[PDB]
Design a protein around this ligand. Structure first.
Ligand SMILES: Cc1cc2c(cc1Br)NC(=O)/C2=N\O
Ligand SMILES: [Ca+2]
Ligand SMILES: [Ca+2]
Lengths: 95, 146
């Protein structure tokens, strides 16, 4: 039988965006990554003189959006392994 | 995604592991009970997500049809050799790839659900391949997963 094998995880995060809360979180945080990447780039590369207070503000908003996206991705991995737990339990009846 | 007729009947028994009251449907409350009996701690939102990902008709629970249809997409398995080797590594105090027979007996008779001293005797007999009182757990795991 299956012996020590377990359900193969999907190689890439791709699930549970039906959650709506996760989907809203990704949309807003990703848009903010785009916003703050642009505003940091503009304020460090497209200005005559760098306004460091402005750069600090957008670096703060940049890191919060990046880490928000990390948090969603880790929650997707958690959900995916919870679901694989249930699949593995059901598959014990194939023995 | 194809299930044999034999797999369909076996997954009917599987559905009963989840459908705890037997009323034909899996609720969030039942999945919480099942998940905690497996030593996990899903939040309410995580349980609702598990239901909602499989609930095709949106009535809030999972019926055997929805249960079976999603098992069909999840039949692929993969070997566990590396994860098992990593569980052994927890007890490799010096990170040298070895665990003594004495330390393995101590672990197995004190941690987890435990084994009897007789059961540990049988395990060490297989695990100590070279007879040197030391378990090369990579090689032991490779033997058991061969
Ligand atoms: C056995 C079982 C499997 C799954 C689930 C609920 C049950 Br029960 N919800 C899921 O997303 C899933 N697999 O991906
Ligand atoms: Ca039920
Ligand atoms: Ca349903």
């Amino acid at each position: 039988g299956r012996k020590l094998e377990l359900t193969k995880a999907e190689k890439h995060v791709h699930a549970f965006m039906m959650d709506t809360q996760l989907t809203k979180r990704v949309k807003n945080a990703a848009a903010n990554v785009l916003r703050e990447t642009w505003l940091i780039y503009k304020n460090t590369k497209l200005v005559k003189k760098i306004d460091h207070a402005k750069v600090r503000k957008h670096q703060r908003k940049f890191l919060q959006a990046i880490h928000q996206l990390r948090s969603v991705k880790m929650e997707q991995r958690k959900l995916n392994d919870q679901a694989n737990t249930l699949v593995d339990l059901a598959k014990t009846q194939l023995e | 995604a194809a299930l044999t007729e034999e797999q369909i009947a076996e997954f009917k028994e599987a559905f009963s592991l989840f459908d705890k009251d037997g009323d034909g449907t899996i609720t969030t409350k039942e999945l919480g009970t099942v998940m905690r009996s497996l030593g996990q701690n899903p939040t309410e939102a995580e349980l609702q997500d598990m239901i909602n990902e499989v609930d095709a008709d949106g009535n809030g629970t999972i019926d055997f049809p929805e249960f079976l249809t999603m098992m069909a997409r999840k039949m692929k398995d993969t070997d566990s050799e590396e994860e098992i080797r990593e569980a052994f590594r927890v007890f490799d105090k010096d990170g040298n790839g070895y665990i003594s027979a004495a330390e393995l007996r101590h672990v197995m008779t004190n941690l987890g659900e435990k084994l009897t001293d007789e059961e540990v005797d049988e395990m060490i007999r297989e695990a100590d391949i070279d007879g040197d009182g030391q378990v090369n757990y990579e090689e032991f795991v490779q033997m058991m997963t061969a």
